[PDB]
Amino acid sequence: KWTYFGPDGENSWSKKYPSCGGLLQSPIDLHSDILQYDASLTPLEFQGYNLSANKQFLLTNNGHSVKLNLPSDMHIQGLQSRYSATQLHLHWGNPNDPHGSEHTVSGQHFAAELHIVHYNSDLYPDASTASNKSEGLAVLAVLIEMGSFNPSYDKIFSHLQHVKYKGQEAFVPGFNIEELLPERTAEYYRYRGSLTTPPCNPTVLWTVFRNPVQISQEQLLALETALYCTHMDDPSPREMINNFRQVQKFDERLVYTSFS
Amino acid sequence: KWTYFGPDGENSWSKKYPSCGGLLQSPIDLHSDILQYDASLTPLEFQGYNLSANKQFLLTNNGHSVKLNLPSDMHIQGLQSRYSATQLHLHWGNPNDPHGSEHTVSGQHFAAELHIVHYNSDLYPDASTASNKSEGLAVLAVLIEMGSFNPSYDKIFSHLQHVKYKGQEAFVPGFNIEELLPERTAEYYRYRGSLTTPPCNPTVLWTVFRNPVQISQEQLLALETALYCTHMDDPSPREMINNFRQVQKFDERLVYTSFSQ
Ligand SMILES: NS(=O)(=O)c1c(F)c(F)c(S(=O)(=O)CCc2ccccc2)c(NCc2ccccc2)c1F
Ligand SMILES: NS(=O)(=O)c1c(F)c(F)c(S(=O)(=O)CCc2ccccc2)c(NCc2ccccc2)c1F
Ligand SMILES: [Zn+2]
Ligand SMILES: [Zn+2]
- Quick check: is A231 catalytic? no
CA atoms within 13 A on the CB side of B217: 3
* CB atoms near residue B174 (< 10 Å): 17
Beta bridge partners of A104: A29, A109
With H, G, I as helix, E, B as strand and everything else as coil, classify residue A92.
Answer: strand
Q: How far apart are CA A161 and CA A159, in angstroms?
A: 6
A35 backbone dihedrals φ, ψ, rounded to 5°:
-100, 150
Q: For chain B, what are the domain ranges?
A: 1-261
Distance from CA of B2 to the nearest CA of A (A): 13
Stated resolution in angstroms = 1.8
Measured in whole angstroms, the distance separating CA A144 from the mean position of its chain's CA atoms is 11
| Contact status, residue A94 vs residue A241, Cβ threshold 8 Å | yes
With H, G, I as helix, E, B as strand and everything else as coil, classify residue B234.
Answer: coil
Residues that constitute the known binding site of B for substrate: 196-197
**Would you say the CB of residue B196 lies under 6 angstroms from ligand 2?**
yes
A13 backbone dihedrals φ, ψ, rounded to 5°:
-55, -35
Per-residue burial over A209-242, b = 16 or more CB atoms within 10 Å of its CB, e = otherwise:
bbebbbbbeebbebbbebbbbbeeeeeeeeebbb
- Chain B residues in contact with A98 by the CB 8 A cut-off are 33
Report the top-level CATH class of A1-260.
alpha beta
Amino acid making up residue B40: S
Q: Give, in order, the Cα–Cα distances in Å from A62 to each of A55, A67, A123, A219, B136.
A: 22, 7, 27, 20, 41
Q: How far apart are CA A103 and CA A125, in angstroms?
A: 29
| Contact status, residue B118 vs residue B139, Cβ threshold 8 Å | yes
Report the top-level CATH class of B1-261.
alpha beta
Q: Give, in order, the Cα–Cα distances in Å from A260 to each of A40, A125, A256, B236.
A: 12, 37, 10, 38
Q: How far apart are CA A139 and CA A128, in angstroms?
A: 14
Identity of the residue in A6, A11, A99 whose CB atom sits nearest the CB atom of B14: A11
Q: How far apart are CA B130 and CA B21, in angstroms?
A: 20
Q: How far apart are CA A253 and CA A251, in angstroms?
A: 5
Q: How far apart are CA A215 and CA A150, in angstroms?
A: 5
Q: Give, in order, the Cα–Cα distances in Å from B41 to each of A143, B80, B183, B189, B191.
A: 37, 12, 17, 9, 11
Question: Which chain B residue's Cα is nearest to A244?
Answer: B249
DSSP A29-82: EE-GGGEEE-TT----EEES-B--TTSEEEEEE-SSSEEEE--TT-EEESSSS-
Of residues B1, B7, B9, the one with CA closest to residue B244: B9
Identity of the residue in B9, B15, B107 whose CB atom sits nearest the CB atom of A15: B15
| Contact status, residue A44 vs residue A185, Cβ threshold 8 Å | yes
Q: Give, in order, the Cα–Cα distances in Å from A13 to each of A130, B13, B21, B248.
A: 22, 11, 9, 14
- Chain B residues in contact with A242 by the CB 8 A cut-off are 249, 251
Method: X-ray
* CB atoms near residue A167 (< 10 Å): 12
Amino acid making up residue B44: L
Element (H, E) at A144: strand A137-146
Question: Are the Cβ atoms of B13 and A11 closer than 8 angstroms?
Answer: yes
**Would you say the CB of residue A140 lies under 6 angstroms from ligand 1?**
no
Question: Are the Cβ atoms of A11 and B21 closer than 8 angstroms?
Answer: yes
| Contact status, residue A92 vs residue A241, Cβ threshold 8 Å | yes
B161 backbone dihedrals φ, ψ, rounded to 5°:
-70, -5
Burial (0-12, 13-18, 19+ Cβ within 10 Å), B36 = exposed
